């Protein structure tokens, strides 16, 4: 097999509960509509996003030998998407997501796996070799997969999410990947952290994702960021800003591996992000090629 | 119609309906902290306590319990089956396309519990009546959870000459949904929590129903038992067990019922059956979780005699 983008880590299972309002009314118990179990989470989005754009994605991760684990397996099977895994006693990552009619989406994340577990590198090595780009989730063990992906001469990316710019946990990913993505939300002195990443890391550029006010792209030796205005899709207004980041990354990677322009890949990402934001956290939806091209041309 | 375990031997207590699967989430506080997302310790999936607690309590006391209910042909369904098999408790079920009943339960360190319940099954649904009828023939007593279709199981059990019980839980004494159960069972259990005018509701229950007595559970202040003749309630103080202080009182009611039923079916004395019920209740409260541990015979007798 051969993949455009290998995703390492992050697959999990979401249990979605529709509630009247957030904050929750003050009661001992309340009846809710059917609670759906779906595949969701941070890494799963990039793989599905890549696949939706007609590129070949794949996944390497640690799941559980449990019902949710088999659920993930079968779900990946239904798509054209190869998945390589080992199982650990602690079981599959899972979440409960509280969503409302509004779109405000509370998420209770269960990381599940022991922090200090490190799998046999056989989990990622064949994938890395059969893959063109490797996107690496900040699962604690995946830091060694990142190591290998660089060593194998594949281009790498990673998504730091809410990182404050000081914490040591993220630094290996921040300093070890070619294309680094991070949320602006927890970023005290953006330009400082960015400079630090260039000082101490191998990053070719850094994409900051600020949601509402779009995204900023920092490159080496540019004192100023390319500013990317957020994108509005007629008929598909913002309803849920949860899950945008993975759709942004997926589209960025697909465009960039195709065309090679950082500026244009950033706008592709912005479209992808906007598309996810216009989707109801009840159904899974990723921009396809036809729509991306249409919107990008505008 | 699918029977697991010994769907052959006589049962002391058949439980009808109520089983589901709980996803238990341990959270920082109720009301919830203000965030898009926070992380929690591992989320455990277990069988709930609603029908399951009573069956377990009865079995724990060395009596033969059994379950008849509607589950889904899904993973939560298979968990329920395997869980009953591991516990040694026969279960008979049918499956429905809407799937197994499930909940997400939000609990904190205090004990404050919030349940988000997904019943799945259609309100007006009624399973194959063979589901409870076959149980009724092989069972001595029938305890009926307030599933909507279970009202018809209750009728059939009375008609068949079985003694019946039910747990109305938090009933206001006004809602019409519960009345078939309130007026239709021999032994009625109800929570005080939502009871506006207890003595009124009790009087109503004896006037319009076949109940021999009404047990009102009140947690902190114990339990009150009303009989037909007696104009006054029998009051049963809560019970303190040395070495087992109170840690979690959720699910206690199920244990009260299981122990009450086991004693009463043997001796027939209501006052003592109530005290057995209190011991069962006290035991459950000293365990963390809703259906974690049930008093056995040796311990009931020991504590009951003291
Ligand atoms: C995917 C997840 O990434 C981020 O979480 C990471 C933390 O920032 C790190 O501190 C580290 O957490 C570990 C801690 O060192 C320690 O407390 C230990 O108990 O283990 C923790 C994890 O086991 O690593 C975390 C990644 O595992 C970020 O903060 C978090 O918000 C991210 N998850 C959300 C993302 C999305 C969308 O991408 C939602 O769909 C998910 O359900 C959220 O959980
Ligand atoms: C066991 C359960 O009993 C009670 O819930 C019942 C309601 O009180 C009934 O009114 C009826 O609800 C139906 C309504 O008529 C209507 O809204 C319709 O749309 O369908 C509703 C669902 O059938 O039936 C309910 C049971 O199905 C009681 O109020 C409730 O507290 C009980 N459930 C929780 C109780 C405990 C403790 O026993 C929690 O720990 C459990 O996890 C909850 O499931
Ligand atoms: N309300 C919005 N309007 C327009 N675009 C949005 C909106 N929210 C998000 N986006 C798009 O999604 C991208 C990232 O959004 P955001 O920064 O909110 O993700 P995030 O919260 O970092 O994701 P994660 O859950 O991975 O942390 C932005 O670049 C933006 O283009
Ligand atoms: N804190 C406690 N101390 C002593 N006994 C208790 C305590 N809580 C409950 N019990 C015993 O359990 C019985 C039921 O209490 P309670 O009314 O809280 O049940 P419930 O919450 O209605 O049950 P469920 O949660 O199944 O609906 C009481 O009659 C009491 O004897
Ligand atoms: Ca990711
Ligand atoms: Ca992000
Ligand atoms: Ca329950
Ligand atoms: Ca019950
Ligand atoms: Ca009760």
XYZ file of C-alpha atoms and ligand atoms in Angstrom:
759
model
C 0.000 0.000 0.000
C 0.930 3.705 -0.348
C -0.434 6.778 1.495
C -0.365 10.536 0.974
C -0.771 11.231 4.691
C -0.131 8.900 7.610
C -1.789 9.916 10.853
C -0.194 8.752 14.095
C -2.364 8.578 17.213
C -5.566 10.227 18.351
C -8.321 7.826 17.304
C -11.073 7.493 19.897
C -14.808 7.027 20.398
C -17.407 9.777 21.096
C -20.701 9.335 22.971
C -22.888 12.281 22.013
C -25.647 13.522 24.309
C -28.117 16.236 23.276
C -29.002 18.444 26.232
C -31.535 21.265 26.683
C -29.041 23.936 27.656
C -25.555 24.631 28.930
C -25.222 25.081 31.811
C -27.308 22.007 32.593
C -30.577 22.491 34.478
C -30.247 21.527 38.128
C -31.872 18.098 38.406
C -31.110 14.570 39.669
C -31.933 13.029 36.287
C -33.314 13.958 32.878
C -34.422 12.189 29.717
C -32.461 12.756 26.509
C -32.803 11.706 22.848
C -30.778 8.709 21.657
C -27.150 8.839 22.674
C -25.076 8.050 19.600
C -21.675 6.393 19.669
C -19.439 7.607 16.821
C -15.787 7.676 15.829
C -14.456 11.138 16.524
C -11.413 12.885 18.020
C -8.336 14.743 16.968
C -6.472 12.277 14.758
C -9.490 10.674 13.173
C -10.499 13.998 11.595
C -7.257 14.508 9.698
C -7.439 10.983 8.215
C -11.099 11.341 7.237
C -10.496 14.862 5.994
C -7.645 13.678 3.793
C -9.737 10.806 2.474
C -12.695 13.101 1.746
C -10.476 15.168 -0.551
C -9.723 12.025 -2.563
C -6.230 11.568 -1.138
C -4.988 8.289 0.361
C -4.845 8.440 4.171
C -3.829 5.856 6.767
C -3.650 5.536 10.533
C -1.379 4.094 13.202
C -2.550 4.166 16.833
C -3.154 2.451 20.158
C -6.712 1.238 20.652
C -8.318 -1.124 23.135
C -9.390 -4.714 22.711
C -12.943 -3.576 23.486
C -16.267 -2.809 21.800
C -15.245 0.760 21.029
C -11.943 -0.573 19.703
C -13.686 -2.957 17.313
C -16.054 -0.121 16.430
C -13.107 2.007 15.272
C -11.680 -0.909 13.328
C -14.908 -1.605 11.463
C -15.509 2.099 10.854
C -12.072 2.490 9.242
C -12.746 -0.683 7.285
C -15.917 0.772 5.757
C -13.818 3.622 4.377
C -10.889 3.014 2.037
C -8.603 3.700 4.980
C -5.855 1.318 6.204
C -5.387 1.268 9.968
C -2.485 -0.282 11.865
C -2.745 -0.823 15.597
C -1.677 -2.505 18.791
C -3.977 -2.988 21.789
C -3.263 -2.053 25.401
C -5.036 -3.217 28.563
C -6.193 0.318 29.416
C -8.555 0.295 26.424
C -9.666 2.746 23.736
C -9.787 6.521 24.281
C -13.361 7.752 24.666
C -15.345 10.958 25.152
C -18.759 12.088 26.236
C -19.856 15.168 24.261
C -22.709 17.326 25.514
C -24.225 19.281 22.631
C -27.179 21.685 22.548
C -29.529 23.017 19.882
C -27.424 26.180 19.920
C -24.196 24.401 19.071
C -22.310 24.943 22.321
C -20.482 21.647 22.676
C -19.088 20.499 26.027
C -16.559 17.652 25.789
C -15.415 15.251 28.527
C -12.208 13.615 27.311
C -10.916 10.301 28.630
C -7.303 9.826 27.391
C -7.379 6.365 28.964
C -3.852 5.092 28.100
C -1.032 5.052 30.677
C 1.185 8.081 30.130
C 4.418 6.068 30.215
C 3.433 3.361 27.737
C 5.590 3.262 24.604
C 4.670 0.828 21.855
C 6.910 -1.282 19.659
C 7.964 1.088 16.830
C 6.566 -1.606 14.470
C 3.303 0.269 14.911
C 4.490 3.194 12.792
C 7.581 2.160 10.849
C 5.954 0.336 7.921
C 3.408 3.111 7.647
C 6.082 5.808 7.677
C 7.852 3.979 4.848
C 4.714 3.630 2.748
C 3.562 7.184 3.426
C 4.480 10.456 1.776
C 3.711 12.774 4.726
C 3.294 11.915 8.415
C 0.982 13.914 10.666
C 1.674 13.290 14.318
C -0.733 13.721 17.210
C 0.708 14.751 20.549
C 0.085 11.354 22.162
C 2.986 10.994 24.604
C 4.473 7.981 22.826
C 4.068 9.440 19.338
C 7.065 11.682 20.000
C 9.219 8.678 18.958
C 7.192 8.155 15.785
C 7.957 11.799 14.929
C 11.621 10.999 15.466
C 11.435 8.120 12.995
C 9.405 10.017 10.386
C 12.042 12.738 10.216
C 14.759 10.063 10.067
C 12.976 8.322 7.202
C 13.001 11.581 5.222
C 9.244 12.160 5.226
C 7.834 15.652 5.728
C 6.124 15.980 9.096
C 3.357 17.981 10.729
C 1.843 18.127 14.195
C -1.039 19.850 15.978
C -0.098 21.357 19.347
C -3.699 22.433 20.178
C -3.946 24.649 23.278
C -0.298 25.041 24.194
C 0.786 27.898 26.448
C 4.219 28.080 24.814
C 6.136 27.164 27.967
C 5.125 23.572 28.869
C 7.827 20.961 28.142
C 5.497 18.155 27.039
C 4.793 19.703 23.636
C 8.310 20.901 22.882
C 9.480 17.717 21.136
C 6.561 18.044 18.715
C 6.966 21.810 18.514
C 10.698 21.536 17.865
C 10.687 18.312 15.853
C 8.179 18.736 13.042
C 8.374 20.590 9.715
C 4.875 22.134 9.693
C 3.593 23.007 13.148
C -0.054 23.843 13.976
C -1.116 25.417 17.276
C -4.212 27.051 18.732
C -3.890 30.751 19.506
C -6.236 30.312 22.461
C -3.594 29.571 25.099
C -0.864 31.618 23.504
C 0.611 34.344 25.703
C 2.973 36.245 23.351
C 2.414 34.524 20.025
C 5.421 36.077 18.239
C 7.654 35.080 21.147
C 6.677 31.419 21.149
C 6.952 31.339 17.346
C 10.448 32.782 17.477
C 11.387 30.194 20.099
C 10.162 27.361 17.857
C 12.374 28.611 15.019
C 15.263 29.085 17.430
C 15.064 25.624 18.988
C 13.316 23.622 16.253
C 13.335 22.470 12.622
C 9.979 24.023 11.658
C 9.735 25.465 8.165
C 6.674 27.418 9.218
C 4.089 27.720 11.979
C 0.338 27.932 11.409
C -1.574 29.581 14.231
C -5.301 28.894 14.241
C -7.428 31.596 15.821
C -10.823 30.387 14.688
C -13.047 33.461 14.629
C -10.360 35.820 13.328
C -8.923 33.145 11.042
C -5.282 32.066 10.992
C -1.766 33.492 10.958
C 1.164 31.862 9.203
C 4.709 32.522 10.416
C 7.737 31.587 8.297
C 11.483 31.720 8.990
C 13.022 35.208 8.630
C 9.619 36.858 8.195
C 9.067 39.276 11.047
C 5.406 39.360 10.050
C 2.787 36.621 9.525
C 0.751 35.976 6.407
C -2.735 36.821 7.643
C -5.532 34.606 6.408
C -9.057 35.986 6.655
C -11.665 33.456 7.807
C -13.992 32.179 5.092
C -17.791 32.417 4.775
C -19.737 29.717 2.946
C -23.232 30.847 1.803
C -25.926 28.564 3.235
C -23.461 27.033 5.705
C -23.112 29.463 8.657
C -21.023 28.772 11.778
C -22.947 26.420 14.077
C -20.249 24.521 15.963
C -16.632 25.676 16.211
C -15.589 22.306 17.612
C -13.619 20.127 15.184
C -12.546 22.917 12.837
C -8.817 22.477 13.462
C -8.597 18.913 12.158
C -10.488 19.875 8.996
C -8.125 22.849 8.546
C -5.047 20.605 8.858
C -6.401 17.951 6.483
C -7.150 20.443 3.715
C -3.868 22.308 4.267
C -1.874 19.078 3.893
C -3.747 17.983 0.773
C -3.381 21.301 -1.011
C 0.216 21.840 0.051
C 1.389 18.362 -1.028
C -0.250 19.090 -4.354
C 0.674 22.666 -5.188
C 3.496 23.605 -2.847
C 2.320 27.116 -2.028
C 2.076 27.938 1.665
C -0.215 30.927 1.130
C -2.719 28.940 -0.931
C -2.544 25.895 1.351
C -3.487 28.170 4.241
C -6.638 29.348 2.436
C -7.510 25.736 1.591
C -7.232 25.055 5.293
C -9.468 28.023 6.025
C -12.141 26.623 3.691
C -11.880 23.191 5.301
C -12.181 24.783 8.715
C -15.193 26.853 7.679
C -16.869 23.794 6.198
C -16.598 21.794 9.441
C -17.850 24.809 11.432
C -20.992 24.852 9.298
C -21.777 21.246 10.142
C -23.942 20.018 12.990
C -22.098 17.956 15.593
C -24.675 15.245 14.853
C -23.313 14.220 11.456
C -19.771 13.948 10.122
C -18.932 16.110 7.092
C -15.688 17.061 5.297
C -15.246 19.302 2.266
C -14.629 17.319 -0.919
C -12.520 18.397 -3.920
C -15.275 19.948 -6.048
C -16.358 22.257 -3.229
C -12.857 23.201 -2.093
C -11.897 24.289 -5.616
C -15.155 26.199 -6.035
C -14.770 28.151 -2.798
C -11.018 28.702 -3.226
C -11.603 30.289 -6.640
C -13.814 32.884 -4.955
C -37.515 -14.877 23.109
C -34.029 -15.704 24.417
C -33.293 -17.349 27.821
C -29.829 -17.352 29.428
C -28.786 -19.629 32.284
C -31.305 -21.849 34.046
C -34.630 -20.717 32.560
C -35.910 -23.957 34.051
C -35.782 -23.961 37.831
C -38.168 -22.169 40.190
C -37.378 -18.558 41.069
C -38.168 -16.779 44.322
C -38.165 -13.377 42.690
C -38.646 -12.510 39.049
C -37.704 -8.921 38.179
C -39.481 -7.486 35.147
C -37.885 -4.706 33.110
C -35.571 -1.787 33.785
C -32.137 -2.981 32.731
C -29.804 -0.596 30.968
C -26.133 0.253 30.561
C -24.450 3.116 32.397
C -21.514 5.182 31.159
C -20.160 6.721 34.362
C -18.238 9.993 34.173
C -16.385 11.399 37.185
C -16.466 15.224 37.057
C -14.916 18.135 38.972
C -18.218 19.694 40.074
C -21.971 20.028 39.604
C -22.787 22.558 38.201
C -20.208 21.982 35.469
C -17.059 24.167 35.160
C -17.019 26.682 32.313
C -15.040 25.130 29.459
C -15.417 23.811 25.896
C -13.672 20.670 27.064
C -12.050 19.255 30.181
C -10.514 15.839 30.688
C -11.808 13.251 33.172
C -10.512 9.997 34.720
C -11.364 6.761 32.852
C -15.018 6.424 31.918
C -16.314 3.024 32.976
C -19.212 1.238 31.276
C -21.448 -0.897 33.533
C -24.969 -2.302 33.821
C -27.175 0.221 35.581
C -29.015 -0.521 38.809
C -32.664 0.021 37.984
C -33.837 -3.539 37.414
C -30.440 -5.003 38.095
C -30.007 -3.887 41.694
C -32.978 -5.841 43.036
C -32.021 -9.045 41.196
C -28.473 -8.796 42.573
C -29.615 -8.115 46.136
C -31.908 -11.135 46.074
C -29.250 -13.397 44.587
C -26.694 -12.147 47.121
C -28.989 -13.423 49.888
C -28.862 -16.932 48.440
C -32.313 -16.711 46.900
C -33.015 -17.437 43.243
C -33.704 -14.251 41.281
C -34.328 -13.878 37.543
C -34.739 -11.102 34.970
C -37.111 -10.671 32.030
C -36.566 -7.642 29.834
C -36.030 -5.949 26.466
C -32.464 -5.230 25.345
C -30.842 -4.376 22.031
C -28.921 -6.586 19.641
C -25.846 -4.497 20.327
C -22.645 -4.307 22.415
C -24.443 -2.932 25.473
C -26.892 -5.789 25.009
C -24.099 -8.376 24.993
C -22.529 -6.763 28.034
C -25.798 -7.172 29.940
C -25.979 -10.836 28.936
C -22.377 -11.567 29.928
C -22.750 -9.588 33.131
C -25.796 -11.639 34.157
C -24.030 -14.862 33.241
C -20.978 -13.965 35.383
C -23.322 -13.115 38.298
C -25.138 -16.443 38.015
C -28.514 -14.798 37.349
C -30.859 -16.174 34.628
C -32.122 -13.589 32.148
C -34.772 -13.876 29.478
C -34.951 -11.191 26.831
C -36.241 -10.033 23.500
C -34.375 -7.539 21.333
C -35.611 -4.323 19.743
C -34.070 -2.410 16.827
C -33.885 0.836 18.829
C -31.285 -0.957 20.956
C -30.386 -1.324 24.623
C -31.355 1.355 27.162
C -28.342 3.459 28.080
C -27.359 6.368 30.291
C -24.513 8.752 30.829
C -24.186 9.365 34.572
C -22.354 12.393 35.887
C -21.061 11.814 39.411
C -18.724 13.779 41.689
C -16.672 13.106 44.812
C -19.487 14.248 47.132
C -21.991 11.748 45.782
C -24.119 14.130 43.754
C -25.253 12.088 40.777
C -26.823 13.284 37.536
C -28.236 10.806 35.063
C -28.783 11.500 31.372
C -31.128 8.653 30.460
C -31.690 7.302 26.923
C -34.662 4.858 27.003
C -34.355 4.110 23.235
C -37.527 1.957 23.036
C -40.819 3.445 21.693
C -43.116 4.662 24.495
C -46.068 2.601 23.223
C -43.942 -0.548 22.728
C -44.989 -3.894 24.215
C -42.759 -6.980 23.839
C -43.964 -10.531 23.223
C -46.170 -11.192 26.286
C -44.422 -14.569 26.561
C -41.538 -12.544 27.997
C -43.150 -12.218 31.411
C -45.756 -14.988 31.257
C -43.190 -17.797 31.149
C -41.315 -16.197 34.032
C -44.590 -15.864 35.981
C -45.153 -19.618 35.777
C -41.709 -20.485 37.139
C -41.557 -17.691 39.731
C -42.905 -17.241 43.234
C -42.856 -13.456 43.445
C -42.740 -10.864 40.665
C -41.124 -7.438 41.138
C -42.091 -5.008 38.428
C -40.014 -2.054 37.274
C -42.056 0.851 35.963
C -41.427 0.226 32.283
C -44.528 1.354 30.412
C -45.356 -2.091 29.027
C -44.642 -3.692 32.404
C -48.029 -2.501 33.690
C -49.491 -5.454 31.757
C -46.973 -7.850 33.267
C -48.123 -6.680 36.695
C -51.785 -7.479 35.872
C -50.901 -10.918 34.560
C -48.854 -11.700 37.670
C -51.694 -10.768 40.045
C -54.183 -12.656 37.885
C -51.875 -15.669 38.011
C -51.922 -15.464 41.804
C -48.330 -14.322 42.349
C -47.489 -11.750 45.001
C -46.240 -8.582 43.375
C -44.094 -5.588 44.249
C -42.992 -2.376 42.544
C -40.778 0.638 43.221
C -42.432 3.926 42.257
C -39.230 5.867 42.982
C -39.671 9.633 42.899
C -43.423 9.820 42.315
C -45.320 13.008 43.175
C -48.511 11.126 43.949
C -50.271 12.995 41.136
C -48.787 11.805 37.816
C -51.078 9.279 36.117
C -48.259 7.242 34.578
C -47.473 5.461 37.849
C -51.003 4.778 39.051
C -51.421 1.325 37.463
C -48.355 0.236 39.430
C -49.332 2.105 42.597
C -52.814 0.545 42.650
C -51.831 -2.775 41.133
C -49.114 -4.242 43.348
C -49.298 -6.066 46.671
C -46.166 -4.451 48.102
C -45.595 -0.837 47.097
C -42.299 1.007 47.549
C -41.938 4.731 46.920
C -39.412 7.519 47.496
C -40.271 10.421 49.786
C -38.209 12.789 47.621
C -41.059 14.119 45.463
C -43.983 13.238 47.711
C -46.330 16.150 48.323
C -48.678 14.966 51.096
C -47.465 11.465 51.892
C -50.398 10.482 54.106
C -52.730 11.648 51.347
C -51.000 9.625 48.645
C -50.895 6.561 50.906
C -54.617 6.849 51.687
C -55.298 7.183 47.993
C -53.226 4.042 47.299
C -55.245 1.866 49.718
C -58.567 3.339 48.551
C -57.994 2.750 44.856
C -55.533 -0.163 44.985
C -54.771 -3.672 46.254
C -51.640 -2.831 48.282
C -51.292 -4.533 51.663
C -48.834 -1.880 52.779
C -46.833 1.089 51.490
C -43.155 1.566 52.211
C -41.907 5.137 52.011
C -38.147 5.448 51.905
C -36.556 8.661 53.160
C -32.826 7.963 53.142
C -31.296 10.121 55.872
C -34.243 9.714 58.233
C -34.786 6.028 57.470
C -38.103 4.580 56.321
C -41.830 4.724 57.003
C -44.181 1.787 56.503
C -47.924 2.253 56.172
C -50.382 -0.623 56.608
C -54.137 -0.658 55.886
C -55.328 -1.169 59.468
C -52.789 1.095 61.188
C -53.694 4.760 60.868
C -50.113 5.554 61.826
C -46.889 4.761 59.943
C -44.388 2.238 61.273
C -41.194 4.255 61.564
C -37.846 2.542 60.916
C -34.709 4.410 61.928
C -31.713 4.200 59.595
C -29.030 1.736 60.660
C -25.333 2.303 61.383
C -22.799 -0.458 60.592
C -19.433 -0.283 62.433
C -16.531 -0.249 59.965
C -18.822 0.776 57.104
C -19.590 4.471 57.366
C -21.872 6.103 54.792
C -20.064 6.994 51.564
C -22.694 6.730 48.777
C -26.487 6.430 49.171
C -27.380 5.970 45.493
C -28.896 2.588 44.785
C -29.757 2.051 48.431
C -33.457 1.714 47.629
C -32.783 -1.337 45.484
C -31.082 -3.045 48.410
C -33.854 -2.099 50.795
C -36.319 -3.820 48.458
C -34.180 -6.950 47.844
C -33.661 -7.600 51.568
C -37.263 -6.657 52.438
C -38.574 -9.081 49.839
C -36.280 -11.907 50.940
C -37.234 -11.605 54.597
C -40.958 -11.082 54.037
C -41.294 -14.001 51.622
C -39.755 -16.236 54.301
C -41.274 -15.019 57.570
C -44.276 -12.952 56.537
C -43.758 -10.350 59.252
C -43.861 -6.843 57.854
C -42.194 -5.044 60.762
C -39.161 -7.332 60.647
C -39.101 -7.311 56.847
C -38.768 -3.538 57.088
C -35.756 -3.825 59.409
C -34.159 -6.345 57.074
C -34.786 -3.713 54.400
C -33.007 -1.078 56.495
C -29.941 -3.346 56.949
C -29.807 -3.932 53.209
C -30.077 -0.162 52.780
C -27.290 0.588 55.269
C -24.971 -1.897 53.610
C -25.379 -0.363 50.159
C -24.659 3.109 51.547
C -21.236 2.022 52.796
C -20.150 0.986 49.328
C -18.870 3.282 46.592
C -21.038 2.987 43.471
C -24.726 2.209 43.015
C -24.734 -1.600 42.737
C -21.338 -2.636 44.083
C -21.968 -4.810 47.127
C -24.992 -6.492 48.706
C -25.357 -7.876 52.217
C -25.292 -11.696 52.407
C -27.324 -13.992 54.711
C -24.743 -14.381 57.478
C -24.372 -10.606 57.791
C -28.080 -9.707 57.522
C -28.919 -12.092 60.368
C -26.006 -10.877 62.502
C -26.916 -7.183 62.112
C -30.660 -7.850 62.227
C -30.417 -9.562 65.631
C -28.440 -6.653 67.166
C -5.950 15.823 21.850
C -5.813 16.725 23.067
O -4.536 17.368 23.033
C -4.257 18.156 24.193
O -4.144 17.302 25.332
C -2.787 16.994 25.656
C -2.390 17.829 26.871
O -2.331 19.216 26.510
C -1.045 17.384 27.442
O -0.811 18.036 28.698
C -1.014 15.872 27.642
O -1.976 15.484 28.626
C -1.480 14.474 29.508
C -0.928 15.146 30.766
O 0.492 15.304 30.645
C -1.251 14.434 32.089
O -2.309 15.144 32.750
C -1.621 12.943 32.004
O -2.748 12.691 32.854
O -1.951 12.491 30.690
C -2.569 13.476 29.875
C -3.155 12.767 28.663
O -3.211 11.368 28.968
O -1.312 15.220 26.407
C -2.641 15.501 25.962
C -2.970 14.616 24.759
O -3.240 13.272 25.192
C -5.349 19.211 24.394
O -5.138 19.896 25.636
C -6.754 18.614 24.361
O -7.713 19.675 24.396
C -6.930 17.766 23.106
N -8.219 17.090 23.064
C -9.444 17.725 22.593
C -9.461 17.935 21.090
C -10.552 17.733 20.325
C -10.554 18.199 18.888
O -9.258 17.973 18.322
C -11.759 17.026 20.869
O -12.419 16.297 19.823
C -11.263 16.070 21.946
O -12.341 15.268 22.453
C -10.627 16.880 23.066
O -10.143 15.972 24.052
C -36.532 4.086 37.079
C -36.983 5.506 36.760
O -38.336 5.615 37.193
C -38.915 6.903 36.992
O -38.884 7.300 35.616
C -40.155 7.100 34.988
C -40.977 8.388 34.977
O -41.199 8.886 36.304
C -42.317 8.115 34.298
O -43.103 9.312 34.219
C -42.096 7.542 32.900
O -41.486 8.527 32.062
C -42.117 8.615 30.782
C -42.973 9.885 30.717
O -44.350 9.569 30.968
C -42.858 10.644 29.387
O -41.854 11.668 29.491
C -42.581 9.757 28.163
O -41.921 10.548 27.166
O -41.773 8.603 28.436
C -41.068 8.626 29.677
C -40.108 7.438 29.771
O -40.822 6.193 29.747
O -41.272 6.368 32.967
C -39.985 6.598 33.552
C -39.169 5.310 33.502
O -39.063 4.867 32.143
C -38.176 7.894 37.877
O -38.739 9.206 37.732
C -36.683 7.931 37.571
O -36.035 8.635 38.642
C -36.067 6.536 37.431
N -34.831 6.630 36.666
C -33.635 7.177 37.285
C -33.594 6.777 38.746
C -32.449 6.565 39.388
C -32.471 6.003 40.786
O -33.404 4.912 40.821
C -31.179 6.856 38.668
O -30.053 6.411 39.430
C -31.324 6.084 37.367
O -30.070 5.993 36.673
C -32.371 6.784 36.504
O -32.711 5.955 35.383
N -16.458 30.963 13.884
C -15.628 30.737 12.836
N -15.766 31.408 11.669
C -14.949 31.188 10.624
N -13.940 30.302 10.643
C -13.683 29.557 11.747
C -14.536 29.741 12.933
N -14.077 28.896 13.878
C -13.021 28.230 13.344
N -12.784 28.620 12.076
C -11.696 28.102 11.208
O -11.072 26.982 11.845
C -9.676 27.214 12.064
C -9.273 26.793 13.473
O -10.292 27.119 14.419
P -9.969 27.099 16.000
O -8.688 27.861 16.237
O -11.219 27.492 16.754
O -9.680 25.534 16.235
P -9.139 24.947 17.632
O -10.120 25.306 18.722
O -7.678 25.310 17.767
O -9.233 23.367 17.324
P -8.822 22.242 18.401
O -10.144 21.682 18.870
O -7.975 21.287 17.591
O -8.063 23.000 19.465
C -9.428 28.697 11.844
O -8.250 28.910 11.069
C -10.648 29.202 11.101
O -10.317 29.455 9.731
N -27.624 7.908 54.212
C -28.322 6.818 54.605
N -28.161 6.277 55.833
C -28.852 5.189 56.228
N -29.749 4.554 55.455
C -30.006 4.992 54.200
C -29.293 6.177 53.694
N -29.729 6.396 52.439
C -30.646 5.434 52.164
N -30.806 4.597 53.208
C -31.740 3.451 53.259
O -32.207 3.185 51.934
C -33.595 3.512 51.797
C -33.850 4.306 50.514
O -33.331 5.638 50.587
P -33.610 6.687 49.391
O -35.015 7.225 49.531
O -32.447 7.650 49.316
O -33.563 5.720 48.103
P -33.732 6.281 46.605
O -32.687 7.348 46.373
O -35.195 6.589 46.376
O -33.338 4.976 45.744
P -33.024 5.064 44.167
O -31.725 5.834 44.098
O -32.913 3.621 43.738
O -34.221 5.794 43.603
C -34.002 4.265 53.055
O -35.270 3.819 53.534
C -32.922 3.952 54.071
O -33.362 2.950 54.994
Ca -4.517 15.821 15.597
Ca -6.216 23.223 17.010
Ca -29.602 3.234 35.746
Ca -36.635 -1.509 40.242
Ca -36.072 4.684 45.157
